[PDB]
Amino acid sequence: AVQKVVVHPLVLLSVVDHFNRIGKVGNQKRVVGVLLGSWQKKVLDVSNSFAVPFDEDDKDDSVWFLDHDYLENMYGMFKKVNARERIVGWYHTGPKLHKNDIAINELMKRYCPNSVLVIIDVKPKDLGLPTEAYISVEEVHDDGTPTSKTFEHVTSEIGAEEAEEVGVEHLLRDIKDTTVGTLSQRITNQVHGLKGLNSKLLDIRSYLEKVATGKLPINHQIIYQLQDVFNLLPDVSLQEFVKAFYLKTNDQMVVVYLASLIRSVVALHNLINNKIANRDAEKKEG
Amino acid sequence: LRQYYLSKIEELQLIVNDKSQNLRRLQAQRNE
Amino acid sequence: DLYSRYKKLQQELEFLEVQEEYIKDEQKNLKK
Amino acid sequence: LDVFEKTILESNDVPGMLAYSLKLCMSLMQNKQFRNKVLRVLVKIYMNLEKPDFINVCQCLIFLDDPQAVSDILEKLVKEDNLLMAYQICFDLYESASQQFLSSVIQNLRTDQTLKMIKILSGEMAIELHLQFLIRNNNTDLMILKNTKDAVRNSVCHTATVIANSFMHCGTTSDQFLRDNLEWLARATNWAKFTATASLGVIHKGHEKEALQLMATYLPKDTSPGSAYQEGGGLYALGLIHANHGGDIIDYLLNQLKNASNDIVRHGGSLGLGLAAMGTARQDVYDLLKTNLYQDDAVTGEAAGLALGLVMLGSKNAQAIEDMVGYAQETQHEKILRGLAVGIALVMYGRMEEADALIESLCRDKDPILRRSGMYTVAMAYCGSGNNKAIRRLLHVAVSDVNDDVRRAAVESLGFILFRTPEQCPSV
Amino acid sequence: TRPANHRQLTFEEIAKSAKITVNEVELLVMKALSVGLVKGSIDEVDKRVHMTWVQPRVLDLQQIKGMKDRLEFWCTDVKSMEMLVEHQAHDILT
Amino acid sequence: AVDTAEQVYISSLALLKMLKHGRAGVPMEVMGLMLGEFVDDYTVRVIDVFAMPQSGTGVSVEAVDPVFQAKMLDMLKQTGRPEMVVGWYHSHPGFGCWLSGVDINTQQSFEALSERAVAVVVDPIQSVKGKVVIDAFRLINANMMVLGHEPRQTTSNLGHLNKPSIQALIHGLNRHYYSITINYRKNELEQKMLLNLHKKSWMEGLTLQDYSEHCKHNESVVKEMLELAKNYNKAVEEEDKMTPEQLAIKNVGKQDPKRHLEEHVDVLMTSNIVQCLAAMLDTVVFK
């Protein structure tokens, strides 16, 4: 399909000022803008973005307005500036995927045959990586519905170019960074992974106990799609697994022990060098 | 009675002397 | 004057710890 | 205590053998509860002794903060009819105790003694004695001023040398080396004329004899010059005359800013209002200068913030702190925040633990100006009683800070924590 | 039916449950391995069919409660051992 | 009638777009117009920036048909913030970060519209990862030298917080114009967004790499550490008695023991204890 998408930090920083632009009310302001990139391979990159207006009601999830004329006008404008970038999709600043967004994607799919969308957390109060990405497919089911359009996930990450990296590093002078120090930030990565796993399992438990206790219909899929999760988690108290685990733990501990032994004599060398070069110097000086 | 009040400050002075000896190494490393 | 000898020794002992705590912060940040 | 009172009343030398106990119990001390518990049994031995010395009870009492105790000793002293030992603590309380403590004990000690009550209240004769000592025993030089007359620039050296001259003549009421020339005092473009007008305030310090007519040569409604900044500096100088003396002058500045004008004169008037009422907590001053804060101008922020921090000096009222902390987050300026930092720092005046939570709610905030406000609050909340908790936070949270902007005012907060014992402060 | 603790099933219970003969069992499970619902392997020396994977099926409410209980059993230990790494390392992870 | 202790605020997107457009036209000078407002009489805020089609020569860069600029500033009013054009910027690659003879020519034209017009000079060549070279200049009247340009009622924009350079002092600096001090204002919406664009989700944190490559990597590092320590033996045991003041002068060649040992200690320990810790986490978290 499209494999994975790369976001340059000019986008996802242009989004937050768009939320600061007309997010004065700040209740259900789903700010929508249009991406700009270049599918140079199956892998994709996006670099620029601009604005389109949008108003919709809290209820009545069918009333909305994507501006055709602003899209064509500012596309011609940015083509008069930048002839390399072509439109790839859109971003909405909703914290979760909505119900009427597929109508927006089906409307804008005339300009782009595979219009990806990027959910960007403007206020990421949950820990993790923002800017997830979705694309539209057909999910023909055996239930009886012919087809629907309910998207699916594509892997995403924040990339970098050789000039924007300078800017985002210089603007990161209000935070201490311990990334240079090793054997510490890996442990923080382990802690962050544990917290993310806890948050995802809490969400799964919340949904499952919500649909379990009367409220909401029992979805006939997922409950057997998540059945294969529990068929995994192999037995830790297995004989050959423990027998191999200690066999490799000792092999790692040999290298750790030799590292301590090769560190201690260097420390002793520095000690006796300092003591001799100090005592002879004070013999001369006194 | 009073010699207790001597020996307590003897131990505290030993601790103070040891820490003041230890601090100068860190002062030298900071200076470098 | 033995009371003043005891408390000044107790003063400098708990005050030498704030020097030994502040330097270890400074020597750690000066690497970065 | 229990046996401590018997031991201090066990037969010994009633001079400093039993008077060093107070000093070596007040200099080194853990907390506030045990300090008051050991201090409450010193007024006893100083009072029920056959020779109760009256002058060395005020330093016991000001930490005791009891209006009924000083009321009791003055009630036992008025009917004794010994004026040699009667006014002396009423001058001691003016010399050391807080203005709030005085103004909260005059109605206790007032509801002969009339001039004595005036003596503790106003201190006009004490200010007059200080002024007379300064004018008679006066040895000001002027040759070094003529040496500094060589330095010529559009900068400080010809525009802010007037403030440097004013320190040499602070309180002396002799501006004869300033009115020597008038061509020298016209070299600035509307910002050092503010200092040139404000410099007349520090010359006549405590000049209650020289009222409004002293500066009637330079007033907003007397001469009305082409530059209104002279008129703005006049009210600033008038406020600088009456430091902690908010009588008629505070009412004149209260109705002066009631029909105020553009913010240049309002800056000087608000600074005069803030300086001439510090530690008074007057509500009219507070809301009149809170309208100044809500005027939303980036020239009035230093005009209003320092004033609203000055009138509520250590009052720790919830309204001022949770108004100005909340206001100092949404204003997109710089002078408002810069004048608000010291102002919200001044609502704390050494409350020790009582000012903890605000600091923990502010020192962590993302605003760098609020971080410097937090360091000034750490400087003021634990002033005097240098404890390793406050020193440790002060010398940790900005000695390794990502921003330089707070770090220049970081260790500058140290010098208010260690002035009691400056023996080892240069060592650290 | 068995909860993956002893997933291996002997041939005797296969021939008793499915009422088929002794020598006809293996082709039968080969037929299962022909289609793809079953992903096991067969050991003939001990005559036991080891099990790896079973295709999912429909589940009801009590099974969903049991699944939620097992998921909570897994959900507690994540927090409980994150407390282990966070509590025994303060100034490394800072 | 006074130029006070001024200040310029720049937003994050403005600086990022500034550096990207400066790098994208690296050998010549690129153009641009700034979008912002005068928040007060003291400070000037720039909240956005945008670029135009240009036409560049070897030594000069000119604009094109300005119906682009008029229609762009008309259309940007419709979506969100309707600011004004408070200033202009260009680039000076490999130059002295200074206003040239023709750079100051159009500054009069930009200042004739509004008094508080700010020029901005960026450079993507001398800028490095930790610090971007940036400057803002304000044109001063070349007719008034006898008076003061800014009274400096305080000590903000002075030798305080910044020092004037040498190459700026050659081509102009405090002559014909002056400099202003830049600070960065960061709103909380972008503040708690900018500090988290480096992490990954939980699959990166809990992942053992592989054990075959880990064993081979440890084998290789120990194998080279053998010969490195064998060289270290001769390096210690020689130690010719003549004071390191020249032993650091015979070390300037290809000699390498005592220096590569502790690096190998670091890359061994910080890659072994992390893997063992993650192995324990994986083997008792999931169960």
Short mmCIF file of N, CA and C in Angstrom, two decimals, chain D residues 146-231:
data_model
loop_
_atom_site.label_atom_id
_atom_site.label_comp_id
_atom_site.label_asym_id
_atom_site.label_seq_id
_atom_site.Cartn_x
_atom_site.Cartn_y
_atom_site.Cartn_z
N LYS D 146 33.36 67.41 40.98
CA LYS D 146 34.03 68.14 39.91
C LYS D 146 34.99 67.25 39.14
N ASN D 147 35.53 66.22 39.79
CA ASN D 147 36.33 65.23 39.07
C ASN D 147 35.47 64.40 38.14
N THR D 148 34.25 64.06 38.57
CA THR D 148 33.33 63.32 37.71
C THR D 148 32.67 64.21 36.67
N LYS D 149 32.79 65.54 36.80
CA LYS D 149 32.29 66.46 35.79
C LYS D 149 33.03 66.34 34.46
N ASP D 150 34.21 65.72 34.45
CA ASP D 150 34.95 65.51 33.22
C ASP D 150 34.23 64.54 32.29
N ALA D 151 33.60 63.50 32.85
CA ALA D 151 32.97 62.45 32.07
C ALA D 151 31.76 62.96 31.30
N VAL D 152 31.87 62.99 29.97
CA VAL D 152 30.83 63.54 29.11
C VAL D 152 30.38 62.46 28.13
N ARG D 153 29.07 62.21 28.10
CA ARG D 153 28.43 61.26 27.19
C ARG D 153 26.93 61.53 27.19
N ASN D 154 26.23 61.11 26.13
CA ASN D 154 24.77 61.09 26.18
C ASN D 154 24.24 59.99 27.09
N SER D 155 25.10 59.07 27.51
CA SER D 155 24.79 57.97 28.41
C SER D 155 24.74 58.44 29.85
N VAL D 156 24.85 57.47 30.76
CA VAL D 156 24.74 57.64 32.21
C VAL D 156 25.61 58.77 32.75
N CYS D 157 26.84 58.92 32.22
CA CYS D 157 27.87 59.74 32.86
C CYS D 157 27.52 61.22 32.91
N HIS D 158 26.55 61.66 32.10
CA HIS D 158 26.00 63.00 32.20
C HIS D 158 24.49 62.99 32.42
N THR D 159 23.86 61.83 32.37
CA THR D 159 22.42 61.73 32.55
C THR D 159 22.02 60.99 33.81
N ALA D 160 22.70 59.90 34.14
CA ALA D 160 22.52 59.22 35.42
C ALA D 160 23.73 59.39 36.32
N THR D 161 24.38 60.55 36.28
CA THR D 161 25.29 60.93 37.36
C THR D 161 24.56 61.65 38.47
N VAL D 162 23.31 62.04 38.23
CA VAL D 162 22.54 62.76 39.24
C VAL D 162 22.16 61.82 40.37
N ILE D 163 21.85 60.56 40.04
CA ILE D 163 21.58 59.54 41.05
C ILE D 163 22.84 59.23 41.84
N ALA D 164 24.00 59.24 41.17
CA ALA D 164 25.27 59.04 41.86
C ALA D 164 25.59 60.20 42.79
N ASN D 165 25.21 61.42 42.40
CA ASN D 165 25.37 62.56 43.29
C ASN D 165 24.41 62.50 44.47
N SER D 166 23.22 61.94 44.24
CA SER D 166 22.18 61.94 45.26
C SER D 166 22.52 61.03 46.43
N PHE D 167 23.31 59.98 46.18
CA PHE D 167 23.71 59.08 47.26
C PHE D 167 24.67 59.77 48.22
N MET D 168 25.51 60.67 47.70
CA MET D 168 26.41 61.42 48.56
C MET D 168 25.65 62.42 49.42
N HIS D 169 24.50 62.88 48.95
CA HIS D 169 23.69 63.85 49.66
C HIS D 169 22.34 63.28 50.07
N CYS D 170 22.31 61.98 50.38
CA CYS D 170 21.08 61.30 50.76
C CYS D 170 20.67 61.75 52.15
N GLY D 171 19.55 62.47 52.23
CA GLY D 171 19.00 62.91 53.49
C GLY D 171 19.58 64.20 54.04
N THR D 172 20.58 64.79 53.38
CA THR D 172 21.27 65.92 53.97
C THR D 172 20.55 67.25 53.77
N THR D 173 19.52 67.28 52.91
CA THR D 173 18.72 68.48 52.58
C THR D 173 19.59 69.65 52.14
N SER D 174 20.63 69.35 51.36
CA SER D 174 21.54 70.38 50.83
C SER D 174 21.85 70.02 49.39
N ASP D 175 21.04 70.53 48.47
CA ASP D 175 21.22 70.32 47.04
C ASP D 175 21.99 71.46 46.39
N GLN D 176 22.86 72.12 47.16
CA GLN D 176 23.57 73.30 46.68
C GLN D 176 24.57 72.95 45.59
N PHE D 177 25.08 71.72 45.59
CA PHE D 177 25.97 71.26 44.53
C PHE D 177 25.20 70.72 43.33
N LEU D 178 23.87 70.69 43.40
CA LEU D 178 23.02 70.32 42.28
C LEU D 178 22.44 71.53 41.57
N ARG D 179 22.03 72.55 42.32
CA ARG D 179 21.57 73.81 41.75
C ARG D 179 22.71 74.77 41.45
N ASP D 180 23.95 74.28 41.42
CA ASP D 180 25.08 75.10 41.00
C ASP D 180 24.98 75.49 39.54
N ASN D 181 24.41 74.61 38.71
CA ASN D 181 24.25 74.87 37.29
C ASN D 181 22.90 74.34 36.85
N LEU D 182 22.35 74.96 35.82
CA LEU D 182 21.12 74.47 35.20
C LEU D 182 21.33 73.97 33.78
N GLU D 183 22.41 74.39 33.13
CA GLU D 183 22.74 73.86 31.81
C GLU D 183 23.20 72.42 31.90
N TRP D 184 23.78 72.04 33.04
CA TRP D 184 24.14 70.65 33.26
C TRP D 184 22.91 69.77 33.36
N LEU D 185 21.84 70.28 33.97
CA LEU D 185 20.61 69.50 34.12
C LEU D 185 19.65 69.78 32.97
N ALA D 186 20.17 69.73 31.74
CA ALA D 186 19.34 69.55 30.54
C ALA D 186 20.23 68.86 29.51
N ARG D 187 20.25 67.53 29.55
CA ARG D 187 21.02 66.75 28.59
C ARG D 187 20.31 65.46 28.19
N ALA D 188 19.10 65.22 28.68
CA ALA D 188 18.45 63.94 28.54
C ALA D 188 17.18 64.07 27.72
N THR D 189 16.83 62.98 27.05
CA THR D 189 15.63 62.90 26.23
C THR D 189 14.63 62.01 26.96
N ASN D 190 13.86 62.64 27.85
CA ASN D 190 12.65 62.12 28.50
C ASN D 190 12.83 60.77 29.19
N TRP D 191 14.02 60.39 29.63
CA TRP D 191 14.03 59.31 30.60
C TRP D 191 14.96 59.52 31.78
N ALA D 192 16.04 60.27 31.65
CA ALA D 192 16.80 60.62 32.83
C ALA D 192 16.30 61.88 33.49
N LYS D 193 15.36 62.59 32.86
CA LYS D 193 14.68 63.67 33.56
C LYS D 193 13.78 63.13 34.66
N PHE D 194 13.30 61.89 34.50
CA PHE D 194 12.60 61.21 35.58
C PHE D 194 13.51 61.02 36.79
N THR D 195 14.76 60.59 36.56
CA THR D 195 15.69 60.44 37.67
C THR D 195 16.12 61.79 38.23
N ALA D 196 16.25 62.80 37.36
CA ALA D 196 16.65 64.13 37.81
C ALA D 196 15.57 64.76 38.68
N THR D 197 14.31 64.48 38.38
CA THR D 197 13.23 64.92 39.24
C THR D 197 13.10 64.05 40.48
N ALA D 198 13.39 62.75 40.37
CA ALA D 198 13.25 61.86 41.51
C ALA D 198 14.38 62.05 42.51
N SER D 199 15.49 62.63 42.08
CA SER D 199 16.64 62.81 42.95
C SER D 199 16.39 63.85 44.03
N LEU D 200 15.39 64.72 43.86
CA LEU D 200 15.07 65.67 44.92
C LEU D 200 14.42 64.99 46.12
N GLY D 201 13.87 63.79 45.92
CA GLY D 201 13.27 63.07 47.03
C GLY D 201 14.27 62.57 48.05
N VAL D 202 15.43 62.10 47.59
CA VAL D 202 16.36 61.47 48.52
C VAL D 202 17.20 62.51 49.25
N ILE D 203 17.25 63.74 48.74
CA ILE D 203 17.95 64.80 49.45
C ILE D 203 17.18 65.19 50.71
N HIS D 204 15.88 65.35 50.60
CA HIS D 204 15.06 65.77 51.73
C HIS D 204 14.34 64.59 52.38
N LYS D 205 15.13 63.61 52.83
CA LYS D 205 14.55 62.44 53.46
C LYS D 205 14.02 62.79 54.85
N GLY D 206 12.76 62.46 55.09
CA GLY D 206 12.12 62.80 56.36
C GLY D 206 11.94 64.29 56.55
N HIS D 207 11.67 65.02 55.48
CA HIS D 207 11.48 66.47 55.56
C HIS D 207 9.99 66.75 55.62
N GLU D 208 9.41 66.51 56.80
CA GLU D 208 7.99 66.80 56.98
C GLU D 208 7.74 68.29 57.16
N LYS D 209 8.77 69.05 57.55
CA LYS D 209 8.65 70.50 57.60
C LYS D 209 8.49 71.07 56.20
N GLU D 210 9.34 70.64 55.27
CA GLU D 210 9.24 71.07 53.88
C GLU D 210 8.19 70.19 53.20
N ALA D 211 6.96 70.69 53.18
CA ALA D 211 5.80 70.02 52.59
C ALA D 211 5.80 70.19 51.08
N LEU D 212 4.62 70.03 50.46
CA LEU D 212 4.36 70.25 49.03
C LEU D 212 4.96 71.53 48.44
N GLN D 213 5.13 72.57 49.27
CA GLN D 213 5.71 73.82 48.80
C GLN D 213 7.20 73.69 48.50
N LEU D 214 7.86 72.65 49.02
CA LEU D 214 9.26 72.40 48.67
C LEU D 214 9.40 72.07 47.19
N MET D 215 8.52 71.23 46.67
CA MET D 215 8.53 70.86 45.27
C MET D 215 7.42 71.55 44.48
N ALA D 216 6.89 72.66 44.99
CA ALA D 216 5.92 73.44 44.24
C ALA D 216 6.55 74.19 43.08
N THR D 217 7.88 74.30 43.06
CA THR D 217 8.58 74.83 41.89
C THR D 217 8.41 73.90 40.69
N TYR D 218 8.29 72.60 40.94
CA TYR D 218 8.16 71.58 39.90
C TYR D 218 6.97 70.69 40.26
N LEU D 219 5.78 71.12 39.87
CA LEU D 219 4.55 70.38 40.13
C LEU D 219 3.75 70.28 38.85
N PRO D 220 2.89 69.25 38.72
CA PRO D 220 2.04 69.15 37.52
C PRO D 220 1.07 70.30 37.32
N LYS D 221 0.51 70.85 38.40
CA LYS D 221 -0.52 71.87 38.29
C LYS D 221 -0.02 73.27 38.65
N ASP D 222 1.29 73.44 38.85
CA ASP D 222 1.85 74.75 39.17
C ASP D 222 2.47 75.43 37.96
N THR D 223 3.43 74.79 37.30
CA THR D 223 4.15 75.39 36.18
C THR D 223 3.73 74.85 34.82
N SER D 224 3.39 73.55 34.74
CA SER D 224 2.99 72.82 33.54
C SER D 224 3.98 72.96 32.39
N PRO D 225 5.14 72.29 32.45
CA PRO D 225 6.14 72.44 31.38
C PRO D 225 5.71 71.73 30.10
N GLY D 226 6.54 71.91 29.07
CA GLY D 226 6.31 71.21 27.81
C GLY D 226 6.50 69.71 27.94
N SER D 227 7.45 69.29 28.77
CA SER D 227 7.65 67.87 29.06
C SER D 227 6.87 67.53 30.32
N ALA D 228 5.96 66.55 30.21
CA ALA D 228 5.19 66.13 31.36
C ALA D 228 5.95 65.17 32.25
N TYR D 229 7.16 64.76 31.84
CA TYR D 229 7.90 63.78 32.62
C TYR D 229 8.48 64.41 33.87
N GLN D 230 8.71 65.73 33.84
CA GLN D 230 9.03 66.49 35.04
C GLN D 230 7.89 66.39 36.05
N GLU D 231 6.66 66.54 35.57
CA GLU D 231 5.48 66.44 36.42
C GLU D 231 5.30 65.02 36.94
#
